[PDB]
């Protein structure tokens, strides 16, 4: 509580300690006039831990991707603080990829088939496109392993966690469709040149608002007020653009004004839905 603790969800706490640091160096000192004196870094596997942490006041601070961010809303964990802007891109939207030769032309032909999907926290990799399949009517079972088929007339997805898998699976002929955002589909660590070539893109859910910055519930009120207006300044100064650079490529912060806020919560909503329904 002098302590700011800046974290994310991670599969990776090795590789993405080096993209908090940074930024966590740049806002303790200009946070020292609201009682802050040093920084932390704290990571957790999934959003479920994380918002243990955040509730019982071990985490103060996360940037996440917006359907990952309301999961942490739903259990009572973290609110809003800042609008995020990332490559550029205030919004994002997931896409729905199959091999050029697939059968599959369509959202409603994946009934029958299996879908790679990432982990349980992805907005783009899991909660879009779940969102999207319970839209149409589409039931999605999860699948055990590669050999597990779908029920005739339901989709089945397999979690294979990164991004990359998503790809080389769909790739490999070992999936029939694969789940990634816009943006990670021009991303060559993610989406390499030799398995896009034989992919087509067969569908693509309306966009969501990239990311947020959310802090937890309790949170100080002056230290909240404090860090939004850091963070909002952090943008236009040269002294940041390093930290903001490995900061996820933060390209923005910017208010919740009232249209991403009933993004936010129709957003929500849908995840909500797919938790009801995903159990």
Partial sequence: ???????????????????????????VPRMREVGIRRGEILMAPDARQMSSYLRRGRVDWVSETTGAAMLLEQRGS??????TERGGLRD??????????????????????????????????????????????????????????????????????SKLNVAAFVHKHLIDVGALSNVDWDDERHMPPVFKRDFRIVHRT??????????????????????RVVLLQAASDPKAGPALKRFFD?????????????????????VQRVRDHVE
């Fill in 1 to 27: 509580s002098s302590v700011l603790v800046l974290g994310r969800i991670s599969d990776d706490p090795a590789s993405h300690y080096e993209q908090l640091k940074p930024l966590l160096d740049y806002v």
């Fill in 78 to 83: 973290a609110h809003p603080l800042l609008m």
């Fill in 92 to 161: 994002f939207h997931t896409l729905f990829f199959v091999r050029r030769d697939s059968p599959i032309h369509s959202l409603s032909q994946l009934r029958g088939h299996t879908l790679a999907l990432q982990n349980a926290s992805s907005t783009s990799g899991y909660l879009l496109p779940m969102l999207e399949l319970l839209r149409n009517g589409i039931a999605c079972d999860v699948l055990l392993s590669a050999d597990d088929t779908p029920a005739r007339g339901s989709a089945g997805y397999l979690m294979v966690g």
């Fill in 206 to 227: 309306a966009p969501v608002p990239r990311a947020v910055e959310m802090v937890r519930t309790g949170m100080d009120p002056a230290v909240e007020q404090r860090l």
């Fill in 250 to 270: 933060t390209t923005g912060f910017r208010p919740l004004d009232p249209t991403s806020r009933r993004r936010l919560q129709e957003l929500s909503a849908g």
